[PDB]
Design a binder for this molecule. Structure first.
Ligand code: HEM
Ligand code: HEM
Ligand code: HEM
Ligand code: HEM
Ligand SMILES: c1cncc(CCCNCCc2ccnc(-n3ccnc3)n2)c1
Ligand SMILES: c1cncc(CCCNCCc2ccnc(-n3ccnc3)n2)c1
Ligand SMILES: c1cncc(CCCNCCc2ccnc(-n3ccnc3)n2)c1
Ligand SMILES: c1cncc(CCCNCCc2ccnc(-n3ccnc3)n2)c1
Ligand SMILES: C[C@H](O)[C@H](O)[C@H]1CNc2nc(N)[nH]c(=O)c2N1
Ligand SMILES: C[C@H](O)[C@H](O)[C@H]1CNc2nc(N)[nH]c(=O)c2N1
Ligand SMILES: C[C@H](O)[C@H](O)[C@H]1CNc2nc(N)[nH]c(=O)c2N1
Ligand SMILES: C[C@H](O)[C@H](O)[C@H]1CNc2nc(N)[nH]c(=O)c2N1
Ligand SMILES: [Zn+2]
Ligand SMILES: [Zn+2]
Lengths: 411, 420, 411, 420
């Protein structure tokens, strides 16, 4: 209603038909009179939980082609009686694995989704302490890093109960570099992590006060106060950045960590909320070379690189910024590849995604995709996704944003 | 329910408050459940293009516009206001249409631009030359007016924004149309090869010109003739006199071989297939023009696979290793091509803006609009340049998109609606 | 999107979940800011026809559980090649029957839909002349009337081609009484048919000028001028109206035809348009007893019946109209039943409809329903449908209104 | 795509033109593809009931309201208007809410009634006694106010339209609520045999009263006590003085046995569980009362299967043959029941209107509204009486349904939300 929505690719003229949108039950933020597509960010009762859980179990049995089976009906009644008696329910191992892979599949902002069926799911629902999370997270990192041959993974910690016993990873990612405010107003390190860094220092962390200090983990178990753990540095794979042509590039002293791991999202499955669900894939080059390095509010390195390139920086029309941007990203890929750390360029990534998408239309009736995020932050129209119309809508299971734990936690 | 909306700029932390969207009356295409932000021509429940506004459609569209004009000149509720409203209503009642005053036409056109959420050049919105062509009755008349526009707008390379507005629709069978999508474009030819010579985007329109008697030079940069429809008649061919057509040969400040690629482009960017809608009136022929942002030419026109597709050609001459995508040879060539376009326009003294300059200006414009107007409808998908996105400020700037009227609307290509 | 909608019955507290609304592709008339629920009324190119045909063919093959089969794929090719060469296509007999039955099934304004699958389909697509139409219509009347034991049926004449060769039954119904405007402004007969009666007279029909004269048929074949045909009187079943207690009722001289046959609607199946598709079922009493007899703009008999009942007509609060109304409707039912003419009272009808809805929600995931039309014109809240929430949406195949042929026709 | 809309009456052929709907700001719950005209409480994308208005929601709702008020007294753009508007904004900015002047409160209450698309009594909209109870602080305070209301409204049988408005929501933790759905209703008791003694619609609420200390007489027409919640506190019980509760014994003007059925009803129909929204301000306790239409009692209260369900009992005393539906025994008893109710109220000099008279007035009302206001939002499903529909003019009247503010809204039953 409308049953069918068409997307057109204006390069290839290929038109696909979406019916997957019909399965959407959650609102996106737009209305018929306003679109919020460029906005970054547009206690479960018994009554509420029965249907959310039914929706999921049905979806799961439909997927293994056993919809309506004695197993289907049995699980359905077990879950319902489990929620009747305990006001919540627990997922089967099969269900947890399926739901996690499907949240990834449904992540409309992730360009990496062709990989969605290949995900190592670590079940950490038996975890009860912060040192326990730290062990789990350490296993996760080691597995995923795999000496540079990166592997996709997630670690799922216990679901929320009453919102007062929440497991959280306070880090926004498992591995980031610290940020420190200087007396002159500037930032040393990554300006994104100044606040988090302060909380760590305030919690006892001894900072090297350098440009690329790997942050400690701040782990919260069962609603308790978070505890500081340092990841063993042998476990943290880093890649020093150099240029295949410019030998002065290494002189800039730039590096980045190999493992991209989001740790501040909330994984929702059948109405259950896993508020500590760190996951990791591998890097697309532009995340590091365009955003992390060249965002004005990040490491902001365009000026220095341009200087060493000896470019005329007097006029914007010389595109000196654009020239540096390419060399920078060239270096990042050149460096990761040279050290045999899994990395993908934006051309290759975006081509894979179009393929994934066409697969998804063929086998699922659509692929929710957020154009604003999917198109790379440089060279946009020279990638195929720029010319690909997309539909954005919300499917469950999903990954969602949640408040930063340090805004709602009482010590 | 109605509420003010915040947009945040994620680099500057600046937060603006949108109130203007509460005045929106037209649909965006999205729903509460499905966002259509990247669909080019979403369906918006707009009435069929072959149909004309009824009285019941015209009465409120006209009142809305007359109200906002008199509001804009601080005369709202005045006797002039009331009388103008009374006159407009009688015209619609007795003729089922009405005629805009000259003042209202200029205001209307300016605001359609102001409201064009896809235009990054809108800081210039109140400096628009308006040629009122409503007395035009023939194709040759349209030719004359268009030559005037091209001449005035080109201004020997010191481009001036302009729009020429032909008579509004009536019964729907007497429409004025410029068949050309732009005033100045290059022919496209399908080759025995299977390849396309020239601009592939213009292959169909070129076939029509040839079917109508045009004699194609059959080269790579043949300026197309105008195809002009006046008063619902069959369109006639006119060659724009070539001295009025400003072109820039493309060369590079460092690579001497670049000029040998034989690239060039035209100075005057002029859209001619849109519909200008003011107070329910529809101006189906309203070509308008500003000046280029370099990426328009260097990225899209030159490097789209479905356009001139020159990436491989240029990469060859730069001696790039094109065996792996991860050498980013494509992006490297793209930047150089775009350096050349900007350099060339500047050298020939032809107005052009680079994407850094244009986007910084758009941010300024937005801040002005929020302060003086309560917001600024903007389509992030179109506003962010096609290369180097996140190193321009607009990438980091949240934008609300909504449709205010007066506006520029899309309309069907005329060769799909016209009977001969 | 939303995937699930819920309807509640406020008498029984039963909640049903609609998913069938997702299949909708046609607009209703409402927007999010205005509801048009009580408004009575809120040629196809090659490209337009392909998807319409495909949608129908698909749903047809899905309905017989042969979707994706060999046969399905071939029928799709056949139709697409047929449109490509002829700019139209022909339905197989099986498809015509399926579409007709489903148009009925989807008719949100019809309360008799429990019978939807019991529809006799007469394929009149070979018809070429008005006399041909006349012969077909007599068959339909004889068959459907069936000596009083009414049978549902539809007769489908050829589909639109270029829009200049349409088949049309100009009669709004196959059987109706004439209406003659009197000099004093009043009307003899059925005021709703004055315009059509005049047309008929103009075409050379000799009017009896009575209160219950059966109109002739005006038949348009192949876009030609309509021709007159008198239905053989023996085929027109009629019921004299009498009351089981009021012996004076028969003296009112009232009567009515037994066969309710709608003849002015358009049947749309898979993009094809059947502009002449007369259909018939049987009467719900209130159609005659309330609307035909007691509409102010129809036979408007309330006053004379009230007079014969010796009611105090001086104050509205004596509810004399309501009293008269009930007695008139008792008379209609009693009359039809006595003569063994099929008829349903509005209680039985609405009970059956609720039962139908529940079936439809079970086996189809919903049932489009126009509450404004489904709830009977008297005694609304003592019928179950009054208390039943309903969702209205347009499914295809469908019956559509079309403009009166005497507003379009050039002679 | 805004347009005037036409509504037709199909008996009289009168056609009216609706311009007022263009003002509508709230959602009906329909979409273009799915009509929800018969859904009692459609999702209309309204914020969570337990949430309060933010500054960003409040500013535009307040401006819309103040604008329509000054426009109403023909002073739009005046100094008073500009000053009042500035004053309201300062209060919102400073306190995150604001206060209505007495004039604005009266105007608002009256317009909520005028805007109520489900009320057939709206020809009376301008004659409304507003009791301003915004100085109330206690449950006993509410009780006194409510007694004043019942006494004024009842006026010894000559009923008068009235509303009592209690303090507005603040942080939603100090809400004022009348837990009763109506000021005057009868208890209901579930019985061991599974039947209900009294009104089944009030079983849950009765249980709450009994659990709170109310001593039930456990009869068939027990007048319920008030459960009053002041300032977010737990509610308190108050029995209304029985001499303030006017009741009518039901008898039949021909059927002598009818009185033996022991039926009676109350004279004052007073809704007390709705939310009055004026300019973003939310009045969660706003009991209002008018007078009964006959069918509300005779058809719904007495013949609904889920209410008093008296049909078969009356039918037996009429010695009807109840063996077949087609005898229309139900329809017969129904009419007799509704005659008895009207006769009884009239005989006791207690104001009441029959459905024929009431709907004729509504048509007249509509026609006035269209003339002076350009529209009348109306919900046909609710406006058409529940018996003898098509013999009332409203059945044949096309109506457009849209939501205007100020308005009366539904809010969750207090016991489903309240913390003790
Ligand atoms: C395996 C290789 C992967 C690649 C190349 C990839 C690529 C990307 C990229 C480039 C982004 C944009 C991030 C930003 O701009 O902030 C993203 C976001 C995202 N990805 Fe992936 N991804 C991969 C694996 C995964 C996995 C394993 C998951 C979860 C199981 C996942 C789920 C998500 C989600 C939920 C987002 C949204 C992040 C946010 O909103 O902040 N992706 N992905
Ligand atoms: C004066 C300098 C101007 C600049 C730098 C500029 C820039 C741009 C750019 C880069 C686009 C995107 C075009 C595309 O990618 O297809 C655009 C589109 C647009 N501009 Fe401008 N523009 C200017 C003047 C104008 C004027 C004078 C008008 C109208 C009076 C206007 C109205 C529009 C409209 C309606 C579009 C959307 C076109 C479409 O939807 O295809 N602009 N502008
Ligand atoms: C078999 C017993 C049937 C019963 C009891 C029945 C009952 C009704 C009733 C009471 C109406 C309302 C008509 C009005 O108030 O103007 C109606 C309308 C309608 N019926 Fe049926 N019907 C039957 C058979 C059929 C059949 C066989 C079809 C088609 C195959 C059909 C399709 C329709 C349609 C399309 C309408 C809407 C009429 C309009 O919009 O003008 N019905 N029906
Ligand atoms: C003066 C004589 C009045 C008459 C004859 C009358 C008639 C009616 C009727 C028959 C209903 C349908 C109720 C139902 O079936 O549940 C109704 C509803 C309603 N009335 Fe009135 N009314 C009157 C006065 C008022 C007044 C004074 C107000 C407010 C100040 C008002 C506001 C409403 C509202 C908001 C509804 C909808 C109630 C709901 O949705 O539950 N009415 N009216
Ligand atoms: C402003 C507002 N709101 C949010 C942000 C940052 C969001 C970060 N999104 C994910 C970034 C990221 C980092 C590392 N790895 C991955 N990652 C891993 C797998 N797929 C993506 N994503 C800034
Ligand atoms: C796919 C689908 N549907 C449409 C398109 C092309 C839209 C063209 N947009 C306008 C491009 C253009 C050309 C020349 N000048 C200007 N221009 C001049 C001033 N402002 C814009 N724009 C592609
Ligand atoms: C007012 C406005 N715009 C249109 C109309 C025509 C209403 C006709 N609806 C169908 C009436 C009818 C007559 C005879 N039979 C049947 N019928 C047969 C089966 N189902 C219904 N319906 C009236
Ligand atoms: C199911 C769901 N959700 C709600 C209901 C009952 C709705 C009650 N509407 C008001 C009934 C009423 C009672 C007494 N007086 C008045 N009343 C007074 C003035 N105007 C109407 N209305 C049933
Ligand atoms: C304002 C805008 O939404 C914001 O800058 C977005 C744009 N697109 C993005 N796309 C990706 N992949 N990642 C981002 O952080 C952003 N930032
Ligand atoms: C599918 C996508 O919307 C389409 O390619 C858009 C993207 N953004 C654009 N932006 C501009 N300025 N011009 C365009 O033609 C497009 N094309
Ligand atoms: C105005 C209103 O929509 C119109 O009178 C409708 C109401 N409901 C109806 N319901 C049926 N079944 N038939 C009708 O003709 C009508 N008429
Ligand atoms: C399902 C339907 O919306 C519901 O039963 C409505 C119908 N019309 C009504 N009309 C009025 N006046 N009051 C009601 O309670 C109802 N109930
Ligand atoms: Zn959107
Ligand atoms: Zn609706």
């Amino acid at each position: 209603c409308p049953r069918f929505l068409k997307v057109k690719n204006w390069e290839t003229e290929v038109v696909l038909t979406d019916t997957l949108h019909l399965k959407s039950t959650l609102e996106t933020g737009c209305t018929e009179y306003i679109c919020m597509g460029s906005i970054m960010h547009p206690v479960a009762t018994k009554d509420q939980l029965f249907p959310l859980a039914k929706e999921f179990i049905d979806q799961y049995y439909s997927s293994i082609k056993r919809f309506g089976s004695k197993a289907h009906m049995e699980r359905l009644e077990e879950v319902n009686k489990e929620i009747d008696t305990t006001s919540t329910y627990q997922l089967k191992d099969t269900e947890l694995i399926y739901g996690a892979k499907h949240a990834w599949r449904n992540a409309s902002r992730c360009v990496g989704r062709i990989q969605w069926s290949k995900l190592q799911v670590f079940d950490a629902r038996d975890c009860t302490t912060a040192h326990g999370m730290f062990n789990y997270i350490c296993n996760h990192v080691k597995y995923a890093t795999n000496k540079g041959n990166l592997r996709s993974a997630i670690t799922i910690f216990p679901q929320r109960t009453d919102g007062k016993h929440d497991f959280r990873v306070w880090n926004s990612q498992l591995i980031r570099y610290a940020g420190y405010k200087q007396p002159d107003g500037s930032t040393l390190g990554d300006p994104a992590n100044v606040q988090f860094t302060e909380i760590c220092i305030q919690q006892g962390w001894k900072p090297p006060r350098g440009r690329f200090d790997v942050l400690p983990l701040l782990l919260q178990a069962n609603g308790n106060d978070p505890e500081l753990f340092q990841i063993p540095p042998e476990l943290v794979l880093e890649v020093p950045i150099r240029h295949p042509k410019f030998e002065w590039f290494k002189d800039l002293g730039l590096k980045w960590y190999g493992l991209p791991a989001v740790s501040n999202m909330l994984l929702e499955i059948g109405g259950l909320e896993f508020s500590a669900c760190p996951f990791s894939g591998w890097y697309m080059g532009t995340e590091i070379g365009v955003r992390d390095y060249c965002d004005n509010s990040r490491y902001n390195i365009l000026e220095e690189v341009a200087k060493k390139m000896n470019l005329d920086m007097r006029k914007t029309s010389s595109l000196w910024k654009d020239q540096a941007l390419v060399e920078i990203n060239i270096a990042v890929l050149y460096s990761f590849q040279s050290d045999k750390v899994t990395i993908v360029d934006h051309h290759s990534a975006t081509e894979s995604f179009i393929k994934h998408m066409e697969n998804e239309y063929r086998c699922r009736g659509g692929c929710p995709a957020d154009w604003v995020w999917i198109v790379p932050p440089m060279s946009g129209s020279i990638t195929p996704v720029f010319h690909q119309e997309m539909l954005n809508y919300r499917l469950t299971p999903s990954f969602e944003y949640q408040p930063d734990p340090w805004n709602t936690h009482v010590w």
